[PDB]
Amino acid sequence: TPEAPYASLTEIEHLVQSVSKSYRETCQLRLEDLLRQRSNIFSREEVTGYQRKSMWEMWERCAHHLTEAIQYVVEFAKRLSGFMELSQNDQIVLLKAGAMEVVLVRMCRAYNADNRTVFFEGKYGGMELFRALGCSELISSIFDFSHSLSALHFSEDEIALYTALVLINAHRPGLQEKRKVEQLQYNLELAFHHHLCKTHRQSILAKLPPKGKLRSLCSQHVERLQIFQHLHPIVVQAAFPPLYKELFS
Numbered sequence: 606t607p608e609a610p611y612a613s614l615t616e617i618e619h620l621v622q623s624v625s626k627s628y629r630e631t632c633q634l635r636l637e638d639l640l641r642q643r644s645n646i647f648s649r650e651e652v653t654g655y656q657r658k659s660m661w662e663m664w665e666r667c668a669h670h671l672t673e674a675i676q677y678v679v680e681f682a683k684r685l686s687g688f689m690e691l692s693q694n695d696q697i698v699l700l701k702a703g704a705m706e707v708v709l710v711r712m713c714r715a716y717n718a719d720n721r722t723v724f725f726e727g728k729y730g731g732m733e734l735f736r737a738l739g740c741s742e743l744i745s746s747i748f749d750f751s752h753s754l755s756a757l758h759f760s761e762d763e764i765a766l767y768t769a770l771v772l773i774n775a776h777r778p779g780l781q782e783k784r785k786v787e788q789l790q791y792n793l794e795l796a797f798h799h800h801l802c803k804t805h806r807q808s809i810l811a812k813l814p815p816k817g818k819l820r821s822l823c824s825q826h827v828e829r830l831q832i833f834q835h836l837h838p839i840v841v842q843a844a845f846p847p848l849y850k851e852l853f854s
């Protein structure tokens with residue numbers, strides 16, 4: 606069982622491998638393709654074309670990409686050992702709190718620190734590309750957070766274990782089986798620590814974002830998304846109806 610006490614070196618190393626595999630199979634864009642596309646940057650005309658779009662065109666574009674990013678995180682969560690064995694309540698509690706945070710972490714892979722650009726709809730562009738949204742402060746904070754994560758130079762196994770820990774958090778309010786979540790979290794932390802020690806990457810632990818900075822940024826991001834959704838509702842067919850009901854009712 607993934608929550609079992611006295612987790613062996615076999616269980617811990619398979620947990621590392623299984624989490625990394627779940628991560629790379631739920632990534633919309635492969636890292637090699639994001640790295641290759643770094644030289645493919647939007648021209649002044651294309652940037653002007655994005656700036657001349659209405660607030661509602663840019664909201665619809667952005668909301669569509671975020672809906673897909675979330676759906677991939679739900680698929681990732683469902684591949685995590687023990688997650689599907691939790692009640693629907695506990696699964697919903699972990700995803701409503703953790704899914705956007707995971708999307709925010711995953712964004713660092715599409716961020717280029719050299720020129721401060723992000724991958725958006727085929728090319729790289731700066732934050733000026735999102736001018737029509739009228740969200741420059743929140744967008745600057747998202748760019749700053751991805752900048753800080755990109756300086757860690759995460760390997761696939763590291764970002765995989767880190768995002769799984771963002772999700773399997775026993776402190777999310779509303780959990781019915783809090784003890785079972787503490788056990789799954791304990792084994793993941795053990796796997797994360799074991800992997801960093803084995804690879805001589807423990808230096809990154811003191812460099813990870815402070816406790817609460819990720820929750821705070823996600824809270825501000827979701828609040829803005831909920832305002833746009835109330836003002837100009839996006840019509841989606843929910844892939845996960847019980848989760849969708851909690852976020853949009």
Ligand SMILES: Cc1c2cc(F)cc1NS(=O)(=O)CCCCC[C@H]1CN(CCN1C(=O)CC1CC1)C2
Pocket residue numbers: 667670671674711712713715716723724725735738740743744747748751826829830
């Ligand atoms: C595009 C992007 C940004 C930052 C970053 F680090 C990485 C990417 N690239 S990505 O991960 O491949 C794309 C995934 C969609 C994210 C859209 C998100 C962030 N972009 C600004 C618009 N935005 C909003 O939520 C606007 C809402 C508040 C009104 C900038």
Ligand SMILES: O=C(O)c1ccc(-c2nn(C(=O)c3c(Cl)cccc3Cl)c3cccc(F)c23)cc1
Pocket residue numbers: 668669671672675676700701702704705827830831834839842843844845846848849852
């Ligand atoms: O398909 C499904 O069932 C589904 C279910 C939940 C969501 C979802 N949307 N969401 C937004 O912030 C959001 C809004 Cl408020 C408007 C537009 C775009 C987005 Cl991504 C979340 C935040 C945290 C956790 C979540 F699961 C979601 C998406 C899809």
